[PDB]
């Protein structure tokens, strides 16, 4: 190095190039993977992360844990990004992607240290991943008769398998049945905004319920609200986007009068406008009035005098769910309130749930939405319950799209590893080592399962390898008996697309990391 009186790049630029930087990138990926290892499997554990503000997040979800981590390593951010991608596309397997990518990099690291050209490793990864995806699609079990009973059983089993790693795994059957029931009621797009998630503190997990309709928290009742009846047996619901208050007609409106008679006429005209809106609402036959905009005390007392229910400032999502459940239409004007634009539910009731008042719309026969009311002893408890239910909902939706399942517990990966090793033993030998390394790296998930459960990983892996070699496809890790068992017969079912996406994303991340040979870091601007 020489002073170079006129330096080329800006002062403070950091550059790392060659094999050492690739090894450092691999080590960083290993470090990132190590942070989420113990969260995988029914014997997994949760991680607690505290931000600068002092708030704590407790999660078993790999994507959430990685996001809460403030990763700044350029190569390590790839694992976080592929975890986010797996979460977005599938919703489950956010830990498997990171473990698989890190294990790929770990397996190919010794060849990197030996001076092997990265392009060869990338080609081997691409070939192995294509073969593995083809094998997954080939051996995935599907039934082409599609009856309601067996479809329900498959959905419930997939939901239980996706749920048997979280803190609600004790009530996994209950939660999975409830999640499948909620999902089956969505119409054609399976929109997540049509499934409500209400978290109410206090109460056990078994106290959580699914509403065959819509339910939302009471919204800032005005004076005179407590005189309105709080139960109806065949109400008609008027969904409005209207401000029912005494207010200026328009922001730029101005009234100019020069006689006291006109003054009184103007005051009475404002009152008559409000009362005309209220009378138009009342004459429609509706008994429950919900508005997106504030409802004043005058309107509240007017509706109370008519034995009618009012609720203003209802959020957008709650009104949308109410429209999709009862079957009305949101009206910005009350001039044409026909029976077509009026909702209908069998029973409306306001009850108390753990110190909160909730309005319930039940008995809807043709509802296309649902609302989850989750009970728990803590804020993060309910948050992680919601995350687990979201994972289960995503899995159930994907199963609805295509019921192609593979046995979990590492059985699918053992089959893939055996197939890949058999393929690799029949090629010249430069690609054979790398494909064998890929197959060996595919063993990470069952080994991690055994390690988390406290087993002896080596013996279980040996038994699994021997069983797969001698015949058997769905033999995986049996956590309860500390042994191996037929996971397909044990109903440890996974959608095939979960493993397909996991392998694809892990391979792409590994190829991207290997392809980089030089990293350059520009000096910071506006450090402050």
């Amino acid at each position: 190095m020489m002073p170079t009186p006129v330096i080329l790049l800006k002062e403070g630029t950091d550059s790392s190039q060659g094999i050492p930087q690739l090894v450092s990138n691999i080590s960083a990926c290993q470090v990132i993977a190590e942070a989420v290892r113990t969260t995988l499997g029914p014997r997994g554990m949760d991680k607690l992360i505290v931000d600068g503000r002092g708030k704590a997040t407790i999660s078993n979800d790999g994507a959430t844990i990685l996001k809460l981590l403030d990763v700044v390593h350029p190569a390590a951010k790839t694992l976080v990004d592929i975890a986010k991608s797996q979460d977005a596309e599938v919703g489950d397997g956010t830990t498997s992607v990171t473990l698989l990518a890190a294990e790929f990099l770990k397996q190919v690291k010794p060849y990197v240290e030996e001076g092997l050209h990265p392009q060869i490793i990338i080609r081997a990864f691409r070939t192995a991943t294509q073969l593995a995806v083809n094998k997954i699609k080939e051996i995935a079990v599907t039934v082409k008769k599609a009856d309601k009973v067996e479809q329900r059983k498959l959905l419930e089993k997939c939901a239980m398998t996706a749920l048997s790693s979280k803190l609600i795994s004790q009530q996994k059957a209950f939660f999975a049945k409830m999640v499948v029931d909620a999902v089956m009621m969505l119409d054609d797009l399976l929109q997540l905004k049509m499934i409500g998630i209400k978290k109410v503190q206090g109460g056990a997990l078994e106290d959580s319920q699914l509403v065959a309709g819509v339910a939302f928290k009471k919204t800032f009742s005005y004076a005179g609200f407590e005189m309105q009846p709080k139960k109806y047996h065949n109400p008609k619901i008027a969904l409005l986007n209207v401000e029912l208050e005494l207010k200026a007609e328009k922001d730029n409106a101005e009234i100019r009068v020069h006689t006291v008679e006109d003054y009184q006429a103007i005051v009475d005209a404002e009152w008559n406008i409000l009362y005309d809106k209220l009378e138009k609402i009342h004459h429609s036959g509706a008994k429950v009035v919900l508005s997106k905009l504030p409802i004043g005390d005058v309107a509240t007392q007017y509706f109370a005098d008519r034995d009618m229910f009012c609720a203003g400032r209802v959020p957008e999502e709650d009104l949308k769910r109410t429209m999709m459940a009862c079957g009305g239409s949101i009206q910005t004007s009350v001039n044409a309130l026909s029976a077509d634009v009026l909702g209908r539910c069998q029973v409306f009731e306001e009850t108390q749930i753990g110190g909160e008042r909730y309005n319930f719309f039940t008995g809807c026969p043709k509802a296309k939405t649902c609302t989850f009311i989750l009970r728990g002893g803590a804020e993060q408890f309910m948050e992680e319950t919601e995350r687990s239910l979201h994972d289960a909902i995503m899995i159930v939706r994907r199963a609805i799209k295509n019921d192609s399942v593979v046995a979990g517990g590492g059985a699918i990966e053992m089959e893939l590893s055996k197939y890949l090793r058999d393929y690799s033993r029949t090629i010249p030998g430069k690609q054979q080592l790398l494909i064998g390394a890929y197959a060996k790296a595919l063993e990470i998930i069952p080994r991690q399962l055994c390690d988390n459960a406290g087993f002896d990983a080596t013996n279980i892996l040996n038994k699994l390898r021997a069983r797969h070699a001698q015949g058997g496809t769905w033999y995986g890790v049996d956590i309860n008996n500390e042994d191996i068992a037929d996971n397909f017969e044990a109903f440890v079912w996974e959608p095939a697309m979960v493993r397909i996406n996991a392998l694809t994303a892990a391979s792409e991340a590994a190829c991207l990391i290997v392809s980089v040979d030089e990293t350059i870091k520009n000096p910071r601007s506006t450090v402050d």
Binding site: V6, I7, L8, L9, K10, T13, V72, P74, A75, K77, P118, L512, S515, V516, D517, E518, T519, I520, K521, N522, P523, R524, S525
Partner: protein, 98 residues
Amino acid sequence: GMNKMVINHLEKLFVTNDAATILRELEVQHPAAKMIVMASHMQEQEVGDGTNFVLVFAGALLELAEELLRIGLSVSEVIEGYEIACRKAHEILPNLVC
């Protein structure tokens, strides 16, 4: 060619093997290198590919010009020789179309 992870002044990753992208994400301070970078960017704007070719050819030409200056040639003679050779290459190139 191998991808390069380039981080600019705003913590933005740029992993790519595009020469123009790498140069524009690099804080180049030397003004002669600035001329060569502007030439590469002009090549990118006019055509769309060949920025790495432009940079490599310019670097090789400048090293060989340094060698020629060291052995005794003057700057003007080297410049005239490069101009004549560039004209000859432009004349030759159409005959190489396959």
